[PDB]
Amino acid sequence: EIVLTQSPGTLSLSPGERATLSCRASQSVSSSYLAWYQQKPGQAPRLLIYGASSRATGIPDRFSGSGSGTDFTLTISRLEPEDFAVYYCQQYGSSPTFGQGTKLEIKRTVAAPSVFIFPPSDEQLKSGTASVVCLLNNFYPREAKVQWKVDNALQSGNSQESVTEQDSKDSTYSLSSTLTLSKADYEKHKVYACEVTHQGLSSPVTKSFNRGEC
Amino acid sequence: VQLVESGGGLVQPGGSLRLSCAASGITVSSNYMNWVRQAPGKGLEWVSLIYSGGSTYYADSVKGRFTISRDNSKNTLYLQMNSLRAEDTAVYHCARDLVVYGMDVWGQGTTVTVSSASTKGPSVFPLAPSTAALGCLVKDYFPEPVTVSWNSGALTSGVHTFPAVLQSSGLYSLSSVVTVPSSSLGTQTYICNVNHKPSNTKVDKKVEP
Amino acid sequence: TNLCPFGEVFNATRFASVYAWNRKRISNCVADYSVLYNSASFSTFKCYGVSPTKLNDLCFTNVYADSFVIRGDEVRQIAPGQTGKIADYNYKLPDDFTGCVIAWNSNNLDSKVGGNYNYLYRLFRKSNLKPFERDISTEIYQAGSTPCNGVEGFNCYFPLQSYGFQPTNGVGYQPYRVVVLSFEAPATVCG
Ligand SMILES: *[C@@H]1O[C@H](CO)[C@@H](O)[C@H](O)[C@H]1NC(C)=O
């Protein structure tokens, strides 16, 4: 079958500059079929390009398709604010397939996160479970690592993260990682730590508490 | 010129559901027609295609479980989904396909949810500080969504409500935080307001150090 | 006892677009089919309802040789009980098809460096072809309620699209020459 791989996963730039999104097919592929779609948050996709180079009606001059063979390229000559969405390419075998999407994000100076760790509330330990939350506030770029450690043992497979949409004011991200334990297992260890790695930090930051110390 | 999906709702795993796509401005029986879904935080997945002349084609992920049809007299494309799994949870779109000229017309989608959980109101736990940060932990609720404000809507500056995560239990969970000047911790009351309409559950928790 | 003009079909310098396939009627001649089978210059040579090896010892009232150009991908559709834009809108074999289907790569002969757009296929049709139907209409396809009246635009598209053939196309996207032999009152074609 056909497998489209879009690069980069995330493209970061600022209004005015030129974005060059790439689509790579796993085999040689017909240029008659290679469409580009734009998707903005909470909205159905928009066809921008068909064939490989043709602008759908209503699509502005900035958008421009190129490529043939296996490498295809969507270009936005002079970015505008509304152009910061996700972009998918598409091909056709006996049926459609899509690329995994490229994110178009606003470039910003590096900003390190404010980190905070929250121990489980006394109400929850009654219920019999312990959530340990660690917050990373207003950072950029989006790529951060959250390593939980319990008594200095790196914890794998009992955490979940989620991340906010890029902030419309200061173009930052915020991330919340939750570590979930039983009351029983919680009461078996002392130090709970959250170690955050990020480009704006010269060395990782650890916020930690000691179970049972007011 | 529109495509308007209906039918989407909550279904148990192994159950079934029929999505409707009432069209106007294009007649469905004269076109190639597609169902494209998007799972939470994921990309576009083509799912099924139907020719004007009636030939049909499916993605391996739904082969045997999904069937695509139409109804010339109602100008309506259908998608019947059987044997539903947790992974068919997504927003489903119909597009018109011109093959060589792309999919030039799309619907805003209907959302399908597949899970084996019953509705459960959330537990709100405080996230207490000892710039300062405090928050609310809205935990173990089905289904979505919940609405989180702070101080009955007065406090907005510095708020972050995070996208929910679906736990192993099949139950959702989220966090809403705010970063306030540290000095103000002992002068200003911080209460977050959690409202979960499905369960008739509203909570006002007070977050203190 | 004149030999059959199979060469005139297989070795024709010009083949036809599949939407407007050509049909050579074959009568009043003797035909050695094993002579084709043992050519071995064919990538598909799949016979339905009869044996290739057992064809020579047979007679038919009439033989039809249908021939056109499609793309590698699509040769699989020149067979009974098949779906696709070729099987549905260009060339359809009946379910009780009882002939042979023969095909070979024609990139050296049918693809141009600039792009060779002479071969065409039908992409838009309201319903499928009946078996051995030939649709040559170029009426503007009407995709919506308001009628085209011979003016392209939204919901009004030319029904025929062009294969672009380039030698650098991938194998499946390259042109293949296809000859279908149909086997069909006193007889006139034997071995
Ligand atoms: C086509 O021409 C070649 C060259 O003379 C010949 O060997 C071959 O048998 C011909 N094919 C047919 C089907 O007559």
Side-chain angles (χ1 to χ4, degrees):
Chain A
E1 81 265 357
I2 290 170
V3 172
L4 300 177
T5 305
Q6 295 187 236
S7 156
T10 300
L11 192 64
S12 309
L13 4 125
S14 321
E17 324 181 349
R18 153 185 301 264
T20 300
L21 306 79
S22 270
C23 188
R24 214 200 194 97
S26 55
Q27 350 146 287
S28 289
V29 131
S30 172
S31 304
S32 298
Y33 296 111
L34 192 132
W36 288 99
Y37 302 83
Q38 177 197 56
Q39 197 190 20
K40 300 171 175 192
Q43 257 165 46
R46 187 178 299 291
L47 176 79
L48 308 148
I49 300 296
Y50 68 78
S53 60
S54 302
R55 288 143 179 173
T57 37
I59 293 320
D61 271 46
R62 353 196 250 277
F63 299 96
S64 140
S66 74
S68 76
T70 52
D71 297 310
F72 304 76
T73 278
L74 166 59
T75 274
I76 320 190
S77 41
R78 173 161 188 77
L79 282 176
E80 317 290 340
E82 64 239 56
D83 295 356
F84 289 99
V86 186
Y87 290 88
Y88 298 91
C89 58
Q90 178 221 341
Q91 183 57 39
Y92 224 108
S94 67
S95 65
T97 69
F98 284 103
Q100 82 278 359
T102 293
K103 198 178 170 194
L104 234 198
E105 102 171 345
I106 304 205
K107 209 188 179 195
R108 191 210 181 286
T109 70
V110 168
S114 348
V115 193
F116 308 87
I117 179 164
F118 303 107
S121 73
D122 294 308
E123 199 190 359
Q124 201 196 6
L125 299 169
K126 306 297 182 143
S127 77
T129 282
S131 330
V132 188
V133 180
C134 186
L135 160 69
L136 285 63
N137 215 56
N138 299 30
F139 58 101
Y140 183 85
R142 185 187 195 248
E143 339 184 343
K145 304 163 211 170
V146 175
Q147 179 84 244
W148 290 100
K149 310 189 204 226
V150 177
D151 275 332
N152 245 21
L154 318 192
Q155 288 293 325
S156 185
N158 44 14
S159 18
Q160 288 178 77
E161 299 176 352
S162 55
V163 173
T164 68
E165 300 316 277
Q166 197 177 15
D167 196 72
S168 69
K169 293 177 188 291
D170 65 1
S171 292
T172 52
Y173 293 97
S174 292
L175 181 156
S176 131
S177 177
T178 306
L179 180 84
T180 313
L181 287 187
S182 50
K183 181 215 181 85
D185 195 89
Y186 179 70
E187 298 184 301
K188 285 205 306 189
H189 309 113
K190 189 186 190 193
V191 185
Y192 293 77
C194 168
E195 178 211 61
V196 168
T197 322
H198 192 264
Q199 194 183 348
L201 306 171
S202 33
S203 58
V205 159
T206 308
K207 295 298 157 170
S208 73
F209 69 91
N210 279 12
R211 167 185 64 92
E213 296 197 5
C214 282
Chain B
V1 194
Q2 300 197 33
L3 291 174
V4 192
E5 300 85 317
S6 321
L10 173 63
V11 178
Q12 322 193 29
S16 49
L17 194 58
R18 190 173 71 154
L19 310 175
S20 320
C21 168
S24 50
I26 63 102
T27 56
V28 173
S29 67
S30 313
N31 291 271
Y32 301 93
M33 227 66 211
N34 274 303
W35 281 107
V36 172
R37 62 183 190 189
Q38 199 164 25
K42 295 232 165 315
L44 305 175
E45 188 189 24
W46 168 75
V47 155
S48 318
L49 160 78
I50 174 156
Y51 279 36
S52 173
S55 316
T56 63
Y57 288 89
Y58 308 86
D60 290 351
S61 50
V62 313
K63 285 208 56 60
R65 310 177 305 121
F66 293 14
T67 321
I68 175 160
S69 37
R70 39 147 189 268
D71 179 355
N72 297 9
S73 49
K74 286 182 204 314
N75 200 3
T76 289
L77 182 84
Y78 297 88
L79 168 62
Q80 172 85 41
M81 316 175 291
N82 301 329
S83 254
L84 274 169
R85 319 194 180 117
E87 318 88 57
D88 306 315
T89 311
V91 175
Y92 286 70
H93 306 272
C94 42
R96 178 186 60 185
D97 205 346
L98 312 185
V99 193
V100 164
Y101 307 140
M103 314 195 208
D104 68 315
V105 167
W106 297 69
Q108 294 286 97
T110 201
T111 54
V112 184
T113 306
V114 178
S115 80
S116 190
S118 199
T119 79
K120 197 187 198 177
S123 300
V124 185
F125 303 98
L127 293 166
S130 19
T131 297
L134 51 102
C136 274
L137 180 56
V138 197
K139 203 188 130 70
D140 288 339
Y141 71 92
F142 187 80
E144 277 205 274
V146 311
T147 44
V148 188
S149 73
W150 283 91
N151 279 358
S152 310
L155 170 54
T156 78
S157 182
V159 173
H160 283 315
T161 313
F162 287 83
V165 304
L166 165 58
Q167 292 159 84
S168 209
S169 61
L171 281 154
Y172 294 78
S173 161
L174 72 74
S175 289
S176 193
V177 304
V178 52
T179 51
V180 309
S182 23
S183 60
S184 61
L185 275 184
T187 82
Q188 180 61 252
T189 285
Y190 294 91
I191 293 188
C192 91
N193 315 113
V194 173
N195 182 59
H196 181 233
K197 304 191 191 181
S199 57
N200 287 248
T201 299
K202 205 172 167 187
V203 173
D204 293 323
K205 193 71 158 158
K206 191 198 165 169
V207 183
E208 52 212 313
Chain C
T1 56
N2 199 79
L3 302 152
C4 292
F6 275 168
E8 176 171 334
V9 174
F10 284 87
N11 281 5
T13 60
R14 183 151 214 116
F15 271 53
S17 287
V18 63
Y19 86 105
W21 47 276
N22 262 316
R23 165 159 272 190
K24 179 48 164 315
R25 198 183 145 104
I26 307 291
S27 322
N28 309 91
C29 56
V30 48
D32 197 316
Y33 295 108
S34 111
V35 143
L36 295 181
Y37 197 28
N38 313 349
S39 158
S41 32
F42 302 127
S43 47
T44 315
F45 191 106
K46 298 313 183 281
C47 291
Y48 306 82
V50 76
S51 173
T53 59
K54 300 278 280 307
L55 268 162
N56 265 347
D57 310 302
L58 199 44
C59 295
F60 292 101
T61 186
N62 276 308
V63 185
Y64 296 116
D66 311 301
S67 86
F68 47 83
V69 157
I70 61 179
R71 68 147 97 151
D73 292 357
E74 297 177 344
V75 172
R76 53 189 309 299
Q77 296 180 44
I78 318 304
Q82 291 291 313
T83 33
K85 320 184 169 64
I86 299 305
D88 299 335
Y89 300 154
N90 295 276
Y91 187 77
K92 183 166 299 283
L93 298 182
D95 291 0
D96 52 311
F97 180 65
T98 46
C100 302
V101 181
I102 315 167
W104 65 97
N105 188 307
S106 53
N107 201 47
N108 57 350
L109 299 182
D110 281 338
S111 59
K112 202 191 149 195
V113 162
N116 170 17
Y117 299 90
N118 291 348
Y119 292 105
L120 315 162
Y121 63 98
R122 177 174 314 275
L123 174 55
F124 296 116
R125 226 184 166 272
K126 309 221 182 233
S127 35
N128 300 349
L129 291 182
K130 302 172 147 203
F132 300 118
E133 205 170 18
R134 180 199 285 113
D135 194 335
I136 50 136
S137 143
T138 66
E139 193 193 308
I140 297 303
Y141 189 82
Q142 162 178 335
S145 301
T146 80
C148 300
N149 311 110
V151 174
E152 312 205 23
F154 182 74
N155 277 349
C156 283
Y157 312 107
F158 199 80
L160 298 180
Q161 226 67 196
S162 126
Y163 295 102
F165 284 131
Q166 268 160 293
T168 44
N169 281 6
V171 168
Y173 288 101
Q174 286 180 26
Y176 277 65
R177 289 193 162 172
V178 178
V179 175
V180 179
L181 304 184
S182 321
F183 293 115
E184 170 185 55
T188 54
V189 179
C190 301

